[PDB]
Design a protein around this ligand. Structure first.
Ligand SMILES: CCCCC/C=C/C/C=C/C/C=C\C/C=C\CCCC(=O)O[C@H](COC(=O)CCCCCCCCCCCCCCCCC)COP(=O)(O)O[C@@H]1[C@H](O)[C@H](O)[C@@H](O)[C@H](O)[C@H]1O
Ligand SMILES: CCCCC/C=C\C/C=C\C/C=C\C/C=C/CCCC(=O)O[C@H](COC(=O)CCCCCCCCCCCCCCCCC)COP(=O)(O)O[C@@H]1[C@H](O)[C@H](O)[C@@H](O)[C@H](O)[C@H]1O
Ligand SMILES: [Zn+2]
Lengths: 66, 224, 481, 69, 202, 482, 41, 27, 228
């Protein structure tokens, strides 16, 4: 996903900060960030599920319209 | 070049895979700080071209777009570093030593032009020819220096320590041997014979020197 | 179970401490410097914990033995603890240069950071005045030690000494608050203290013991987080101490003490009676941040006052007890922590300088221009420039302050943030477009700072393009309280 | 004309439900106006986690008169 | 002693705690000979054949400060007469082709032209362009912004501030060329593979 | 729009992985990405239906779950051709930069920092919170464009007290945006339209938006940032500034002032009337005092923009049509004049104005085109700017024509000094010290001129295709203001 | 408090060892092959 | 055709990591 | 298993060879970082009898007929082509960097004159001794260019960058200089004192460049410099 492009940047941005050129095999380990982005989106879904659960718990609470 | 960059990337991964994907097993051979100037004909998208009968010395680098013809020679320590525009060295020339032939890149302050070295040109040591359209059968002296756009016309025997100035089209056969470029004397004919015979002298001396070998006994000694 | 993040990081610290001490005092290995080897295993004892802690998300609440006695973990403690270990991961990572380049054979600085991280893991989940104090002092004691570590330069020694004095006095105030509250209530457990302090209404109901107790607890905390009226040394504390220990005691105690405040002040005592001092502290903290940042030179002290001001910008989320306010406060801690880890990673990248001010910080637009881009990104983020993440932090904080009817708090926040925006825009201009000023050259930063600076720079710029995960996290944490 | 201008315009069509979009948006925000007003109301939910241990261990020790008789 | 060492010539030659550390992004052309104390800095460019030796003092080229093809840069023992003579080729200095240096402390933003021999204590001031063959005797502080030259280092001209503004552009143009070259070399080398194939022929 | 929306961001990011010292590829491909995003803007124009209150191509993506303050993207009416002008003009900046080396001015950096379509975002962004983020957000790209490749006239800076006030005004609007956001949960612009506020608070919220806007709008008390920002701006930084960054304030008023706070707008009509009027008077007289060419064009732009304000007030469909069409004509004309003055700088390399002389000998086609656009900046009847400004004028439709009588001075002095400056620039055989370096215009130069002249004439002789595609939206806005 | 006493032990050690043991009593750390024998000062 | 201890152990453990992790992202 | 992982050495050769499959966009990378450089002796028909203690720098291609004395150095990158005419170097003559001590065939009149350089002759960097004899205990200048048949007398320093014309054999102590062959001055006695001092210090300094001839094991053992 977009995590692949982001990782190549994070690695290339890292290379740009240490002064090293933009070259090596860690740009192929940015696939790990693609895994990370998929997990982060998966965690967004799981998280909004849990937040909806806590929100219906709150709606049950707070006097429940009384 | 884009695919040249991609090639640099596949090679690094490959060198790395050997360096520590198999030198991992007790081998520090990769770590030896061996030299890399032995890339005599260093390359770019443009490459240096050299014919058979053209001795290049291994102490000398030939970088950039080069077109070493026939008989030309690049002796021990010279640097024909001509990335920007082609170093179109003609035939039978004789750099002879630690000279330099540059179209070396600046901020286009004077629009660096190719260095079309002529024929039978017996350039001397330490000459620092720099953007030089030096024509054929010309002599340049020991420790000399030149400047941009110079055109050393036929038989123009620049002397030692000299510093020719920018864009100076030196006349054909005029001896200029000073820091401020200055004609000194119409060259004599014995000097003409000398400069036209030293050409073939080194042409033979360069077909000699026969590097083309290896010295394993010394390699075995330096190994221990 | 339920202490597997603590059981591990305590066993791992011992395994590292014994492993480090045996080798550093070893003739066979030529007395090697065990820093960056007990490190590396240090920060992995963090990641394995962060893996032990994140995985067992339902398991953290696995017993009752801990509940009504010792400490109560829940979703808030769980998420805030995954953050502390993550922010301790960044802080150990940025130090790897400080161990090798700077001559530190003292590995136990690592094991002390690990013991402090256990103390903070027990602060976050602290659910009893006694546990809150004990974990607070565990982390504060590790930090007094590792802030007085450098014994050669006398500048770090007196800085660590006044840090110890300030921290011990802050803990004394906090502890007298715990005493007054306990003595006037006969209950220390937050689950017990909550039942008593429902309908306490100090300003309406005469209860002086509990009032002075909550006031002293708030004062001790606002000392620990170095808020404005009680910072009192914090600039000199951050300036004198070494840079990585400053990066530690400047971002992680904030996270931990702020989670602890959310525990005691939103559950243990819930009223609009105590948050008045935090409202005043927010006002004067944003004021002091803005002005002193306008006044400072030394980049370490500039970051000190910037952190004080941003801690102020945090407390406006606590200055109103609405869920939106607490969620704004939590958003503000994550965007203040990641940005501070970034700023301190940058300050650690520039090891070559001595204690030097922004003028010597100059020329970075020329030498290492990508690092100057990153530094401008981070400083903008503090300022709150719209297209960045710090803007999202300050903006949601101000929106919570408006929805909470604290219009004047939002007003002082916006004027102080605009002052800060002007100051940091002027700083970036002076760094980029002029002022060469002596061109000090830097050894390159290592991969560890590089990825943390790079990932955090990516987080700051590409945040508004995806704020859903963090907003969901912080709203869940606020609901859980 | 040019052989397709007729169907060249059916790259959008009315599909007017985007107003029910805002209709239900409004339901969203009518609920959301209860974002900041809500807070802690429950003292009967599990934060009353004390008695479940008290009744559980009161008999062992820290007891006035049970061990007597 | 035997000749033709397979190693060629190691371009970075330390001696006695003195490592001529090369900062990254500094294309150190393979012919050069760093030795003793030669601290080349970020963005610099040591080009073909340029030796940089090491004495009691320490050579140091600054940010973007290239040392072009075949340029010797040594330093005298101490020269404690006026100032410690450790060559400091500071930022943006373009030490041109086949020049020569010794213990001179060049100042920011110079252009030390071709074949320009120097000597001790020649603090070529900031923003100073030197003509070709700029030979200098010890102590001749070429002042700021002033074009110079001549065999005994005779002053020639002061420079318009447009040329002074152009000097940094020339330095960064050299640095662009240096990056174009640095993209031609890899962290380690492939020479070892050829040496092993040579040894397995033995 | 779903896929064809993100062309500049995709292009910029996928080029960021091409450093490519040999400029040819980055120039070519950045220009192609810009031109295709402009092509998709124009096919989005063709896709338009001039018959709905709804927004034409609405899209979204959840941004924060509760209250869903999400990327609501509408392009009805005005925004339709605002984003069109944005795209129309961005390849102009990409094309004014075919400079050969372009080395210190690293070409890919300016490509990546002009090819950020946050202007497209803001003009399509239809929930005034995120909409707020973008004009304030484009300041980071604008600041780097303004000075990194911008001409250095001073130690690059902006009046610091004025800049602090400008950003303070921007953040003052932010407090107002939040007050409305939490006032009734209203996330987006459709529902902020539907809702109804307290008249006592509508005026406060209106002026609070107005702070930031009338900084972005160049009104008389705060407009000084345009001259100082332009004389230092690069050739392509001014083309964007005049082109879009001024349209920001007027479009902000248009969307989030008039149909948002109808009672507050009713109450403050004379306020903006007098403000914009005296601003036009001042910026008409000022170019007497200013000899700096960039300041001259910037002040003419201030004049035109406060005309846009003196017209946007109205429930006159003709009124706001003249407002938005003066905006389009201004993004054409002032940017064409900034193109002009940038060519005039570079071809002369001088930053005094008394030095532009003998132009009919050096670059006479530049004389022709410079007139072809200075007749427009004074709004020659027949040009696009005339249709714009006269619908601005007739904006005194239900009115009683007392602010048109101040637009009297505002525009008569404007046209006067327009002619005076076009003379002063092209006057006489005033031989300059340029050493017979004539600098005739380039084929690419007249190219980048082509589209502005084409849009100008196509509007000025046929404003239908722009007044149509707009009337439905503006008339809906007006009835909500009724 | 067990961990706090352990941190007090580690602290009193790392602070007041005072370079009197392996903290600096490792060696002066002077090597021969890395020296130049002062022939060239 | 041999090596030293305490490094082949490390390479075996690195292989155990990547083989093990493969099995993890695989399950 | 380990050591059979040479398959990754073979796999590397594939990805490395992939440079051929990737040198198609233009003719690219004709350099391969080769091994052969017949440099440090390069005997044409006569061999140098350079001593076991005369440090020559592995860059210095001392061609053909050369002889160096005990203690004299031949520094980095200095070609000595004694191919057409004999060369020699006395004990202590530190022929510094970038030298060109290559002699002659002829120049316009005979003038074979084998270059002979005496003891303690501190020759300067980038010097070009094309065809002159040099006497003992003199100090040639860094950048000098000593042409055919220029007998540089004893203790007479040639200036920095001082080109010397043909046959203009300088006197003793007469400091020469200038692009034309003109004298400059007779400096002082401290001048000769410093000449001898620099000569012996350069001799023992070359004796300090024994790391140049270190062995792979010794190089990687010096790489312990990190620990100290
Ligand atoms: C809450 C949040 C808190 C913020 C902080 C969180 C960080 C927490 C923990 C981690 C912190 C720092 C990263 C440390 C990385 C790490 O040890 O190994 C990586 C391996 O991989 C890549 O180099 C390969 C390239 C890796 C690319 C990763 C891309 C990730 C992108 C994520 C999305 C962007 C951000 C979205 C938000 C780096 O080299 P390494 O250490 O293996 O091994 C060497 C390295 O090669 C060095 O150059 C040195 O030789 C030596 O120091 C040693 O580090
Ligand atoms: C056809 C073309 C493509 C062919 C296939 C191409 C690619 C395959 C991808 C990955 C291969 C595996 C790993 C990738 C590489 C990782 C880095 C390995 C680094 C390495 O050698 O240090 C080993 C330890 O090593 C592991 O800590 C453990 C490293 C274990 C690596 C084992 C690899 C060989 C076994 C076969 C793979 C097993 C797994 C198979 C399934 C997964 C494959 C990925 C120790 O050596 P050493 O004592 O000389 O230590 C080194 C030190 O590591 C360096 O950092 C220093 O620079 C150096 O001076 C020296 O001190
Ligand atoms: Zn010769």
């Amino acid at each position: 996903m977009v995590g692949a492009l982001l990782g190549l940047g994070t690695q290339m941005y890292s290379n740009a900060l240490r002064k090293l050129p933009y070259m090596r095999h860690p740009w192929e380990h940015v696939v790990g960030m693609g895994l990370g982005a998929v997990f982060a989106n998966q965690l967004v879904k799981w998280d909004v599920k849990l937040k909806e659960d806590l929100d219906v718990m709150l709606a049950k609470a707070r006097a429940a319209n009384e | 070049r884009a695919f040249y960059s991609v090639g640099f990337w596949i090679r690094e991964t490959g060198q790395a895979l050997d360096r520590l994907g198999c030198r991992l097993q007790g081998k520090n051979y990769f770590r030896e700080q061996l030299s890399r100037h032995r890339t005599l004909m260093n390359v770019f998208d443009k490459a240096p071209i050299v014919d058979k009968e053209a001795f290049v010395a291994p102490s000398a680098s030939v970088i950039g777009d080069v077109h070493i013809g026939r008989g030309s020679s690049i002796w021990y320590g010279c640097v024909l570093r001509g990335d920007v525009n082609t170093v179109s060295v003609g035939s039978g020339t004789n750099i002879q030593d630690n000279s330099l032939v540059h179209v070396a890149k600046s901020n286009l302050s004077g629009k660096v032009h190719p260095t079309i070295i002529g024929d039978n040109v017996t350039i001397g040591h330490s000459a620092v020819l720099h953007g030089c359209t030096v024509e054929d059968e010309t002599f340049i002296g020991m420790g000399a220096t030149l400047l941009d756009g110079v055109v050393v016309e036929k038989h123009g025997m620049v002397a030692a320590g000299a510093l020719v100035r920018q864009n100076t089209r030196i006349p054909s056969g005029e001896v200029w041997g000073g820091n401020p470029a200055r004609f000194l004397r119409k060259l004599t004919d014995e000097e003409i014979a000398f400069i036209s015979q030293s050409a073939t002298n080194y042409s033979n001396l360069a077909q000699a020197h026969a590097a083309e070998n290896a010295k394993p006994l010394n390699v075995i000694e330096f190994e221990k | 179970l339920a202490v597997f993040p603590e059981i591990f990081i305590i066993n791992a610290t011992f395994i590292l401490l014994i492993h480090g001490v045996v080798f550093s005092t070893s003739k066979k290995y030529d007395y090697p410097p065990l820093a960056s080897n007990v490190g590396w295993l240090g920060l992995l004892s963090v990641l394995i914990t962060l893996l032990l802690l994140a995985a067992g998300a339902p398991l953290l609440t696995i017993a009752h033995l801990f509940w009504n006695n010792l400490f109560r973990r829940d979703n808030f403690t769980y998420f805030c603890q995954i953050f502390l270990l993550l922010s301790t991961a960044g802080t150990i990572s940025m130090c790897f240069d400080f161990f090798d380049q700077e001559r530190f054979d003292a590995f136990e600085f690592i094991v002390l950071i690990l013991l402090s991280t256990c103390g903070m893991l027990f602060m976050i989940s602290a659910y009893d005045l006694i546990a809150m104090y004990l974990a607070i002092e565990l982390q504060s004691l590790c930090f007094y030690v590792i802030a007085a570590s450098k014994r050669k330069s006398e500048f770090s020694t007196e800085a660590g000494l006044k840090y110890l004095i300030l921290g011990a006095f802050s803990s004394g105030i906090l502890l007298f608050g715990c005493s007054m509250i306990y003595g006037s209530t006969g209950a220390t457990h937050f689950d017990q203290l909550a039942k008593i302090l429902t309908g306490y209404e100090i300003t309406g109901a005469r209860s002086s013991g509990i009032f002075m107790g909550i006031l002293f607890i708030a004062v001790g905390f606002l000392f620990k987080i170095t808020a404005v009226p009680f910072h009192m040394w914090a600039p000199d504390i951050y300036e004198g101490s070494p840079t990585p220990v400053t990066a530690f005691l400047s971002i992680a105690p904030k996270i931990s003490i702020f989670a602890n405040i959310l525990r005691v002040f939103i559950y243990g005592s819930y009223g609009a009676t105590l948050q008045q001092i935090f409202f005043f502290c927010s006002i004067a903290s944003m004021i002091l941040g803005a002005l002193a940042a306008m006044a400072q030179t030394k980049v370490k002290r500039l970051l000190a006052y910037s952190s004080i001001g941003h801690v102020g910008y945090i407390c406006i989320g606590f200055s109103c007890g609405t869920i939106e306010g607490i969620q704004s406060l939590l958003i503000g801690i994550f965007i203040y922590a990641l940005m501070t880890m970034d700023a301190f990673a940058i300050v650690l990248a520039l090891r070559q300088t001595r204690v030097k001010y922004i003028a010597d910080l100059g020329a970075l637009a020329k030498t290492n221009p990508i690092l100057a881009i990153t530094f401008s990104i981070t400083m903008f983020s503090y300022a709150g420039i719209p297209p960045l993440a710090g803007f999202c932090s300050k903006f949601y904080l101000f929106f919570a302050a408006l929805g909470c009817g604290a219009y004047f708090l939002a007003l002082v926040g916006v004027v102080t943030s605009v002052i800060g925006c002007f100051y940091y825009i002027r700083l970036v201009k002076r760094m980029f477009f002029d002022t060469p000023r002596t061109w000090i050259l830097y050894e390159p930063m290592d991969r560890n700072k590089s990825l943390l600076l790079a990932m955090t720079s990516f987080f700051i710029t590409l945040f508004l393009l995806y704020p859903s995960p963090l907003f969901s996290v912080t709203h869940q944490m606020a609901l859980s309280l | 004309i040019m052989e397709f201008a007729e169907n060249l315009v059916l790259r959008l069509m009315e599909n007017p439900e985007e107003r029910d979009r805002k209709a239900r948006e409004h339901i969203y925000e009518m609920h959301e106006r209860c974002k900041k007003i809500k807070e802690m109301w429950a003292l009967p939910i599990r934060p009353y986690g004390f008695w479940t241990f008290e009744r559980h261990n009161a008999q062992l020790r820290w007891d006035p008169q049970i061990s007597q008789v | 002693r035997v000749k033709w060492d397979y190693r060629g010539q190691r371009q970075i030659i330390p001696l006695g705690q003195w490592l001529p550390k090369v900062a990254v992004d500094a294309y150190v052309a393979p012919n050069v000979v760093l030795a003793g104390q030669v601290t080349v800095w970020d963005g610099s460019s040591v080009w073909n054949g340029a030796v940089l030796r090491g004495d009691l003092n320490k050579i140091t080229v600054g940010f973007c400060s290239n040392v072009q093809e075949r340029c010797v840069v040594h330093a005298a023992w101490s020269s404690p007469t006026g100032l410690p003579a450790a060559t400091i080729i500071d930022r943006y200095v373009t030490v041109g082709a086949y020049s020569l240096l010794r213990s001179c402390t060049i100042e920011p933003e110079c252009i030390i032209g071709q074949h320009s021999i120097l000597m001790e204590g020649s603090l070529v001031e900031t923003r100073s362009i030197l003509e070709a063959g700029s030979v200098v005797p010890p102590g001749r502080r070429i002042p700021s912004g002033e074009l110079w030259g001549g065999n005994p280092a005779r002053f020639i001209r002061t420079l318009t501030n447009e040329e002074t503004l152009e000097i940094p552009k020339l330095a960064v143009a050299i640095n662009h060329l240096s990056g174009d070259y640095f993209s031609e070399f890899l962290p380690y080398s492939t020479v070892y593979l050829e040496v092993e194939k040579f040894k397995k022929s033995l | 729009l779903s896929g064809l929306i993100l062309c500049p961001v995709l292009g910029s990011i996928i080029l960021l992985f091409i450093p490519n010292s040999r400029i040819r590829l980055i120039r070519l491909i950045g220009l192609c990405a810009s031109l295709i995003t402009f092509l998709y803007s124009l096919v989005l124009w063709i896709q338009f239906d001039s018959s709905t209150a709804k927004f034409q191509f609405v899209e979204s993506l959840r941004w924060l779950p509760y209250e869903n303050i999400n990327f609501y993207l509408g392009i009805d009416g005005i925004s339709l051709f605002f984003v069109i002008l944005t795209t129309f003009l961005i390849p102009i900046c990409i094309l004014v930069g075919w400079s050969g080396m372009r080395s210190y001015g690293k070409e890919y950096i300016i490509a990546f920092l002009i090819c950020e379509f946050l202007m497209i975002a803001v003009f399509c962004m239809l929930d005034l919170l995120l909409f707020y983020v973008f004009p304030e957000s484009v300041l980071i790209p604008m600041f780097i464009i303004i000075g990194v490749w911008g001409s250095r006239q001073r130690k690059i800076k902006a009046a610091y007290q004025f800049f602090l006030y400008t950003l303070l005004g921007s953040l003052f609007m932010l407090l107002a945006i939040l007050l409305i956001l939490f006032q009734t949960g209203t996330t987006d612009l459709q529902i902020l339209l539907t809702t109804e506020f307290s008249e006592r608070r509508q005026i406060f919220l209106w002026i609070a938006f107005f702070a930031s806007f009338a900084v972005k709008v160049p009104m008389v008390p705060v407009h000084i940032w345009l001259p100082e920002a332009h004389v230092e701006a690069p050739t392509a930084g001014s083309v964007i500034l005049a082109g879009i960054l001024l349209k920001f304030g007027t479009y902000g008023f248009l969307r989030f002032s008039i149909p948002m706070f109808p009672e507050a707008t009713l109450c403050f009509t004379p306020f903006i009337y007098t403000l914009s009027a005296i601003a036009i008077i001042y910026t008409s007289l000022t170019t007497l005092r200013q000899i700096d060419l960039k300041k001259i064009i910037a002040y003419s732009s201030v004049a035109h923009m406060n005309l846009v304000t003196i017209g946007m007030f109205s429930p006159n469909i003709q009124g706001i049509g003249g407002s938005i069409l003066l905006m389009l004509s201004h993004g054409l004309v002032s940017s064409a004049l900034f193109l002009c003055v940038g060519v005039l700088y570079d071809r002369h390399k001088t930053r005094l104005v008394r030095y532009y002389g003998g132009l009919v000998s050096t670059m006479p086609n530049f004389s022709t085109i410079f007139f072809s656009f200075t007749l427009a900046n004074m709004s020659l009847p027949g040009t696009s700017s005339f249709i714009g400004e006269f619908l601005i004028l007739v904006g005194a439709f239900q009115r009683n024509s007392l602010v048109a009588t101040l637009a009297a001075l505002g525009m008569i002095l404007g046209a006067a000094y327009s002619l005076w400056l076009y003379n002063r620039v092209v006057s006489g055989n005033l031989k300059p010290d340029f050493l017979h370096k004539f600098s005739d215009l380039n084929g690419r130069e007249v190219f980048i001129f082509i589209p502005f002249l084409v849009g100008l004439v196509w509007m000025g002789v046929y404003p239908k295709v722009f007044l149509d595609c707009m009337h439905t939206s503006v008339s809906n806005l007006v009835q909500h203001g009724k | 408090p067990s961990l706090i006493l352990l941190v007090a032990m580690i602290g009193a050690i790392v602070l007041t060892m005072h370079r009197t043991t392996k903290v600096k009593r490792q060696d002066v750390f002077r090597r021969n092959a890395i020296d130049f024998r002062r022939t060239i000062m | 055709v041999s090596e030293d201890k305490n490094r082949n152990y490390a390479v075996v453990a690195g292989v155990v990591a990547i083989v093990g992790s493969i099995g993890w992202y695989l399950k």
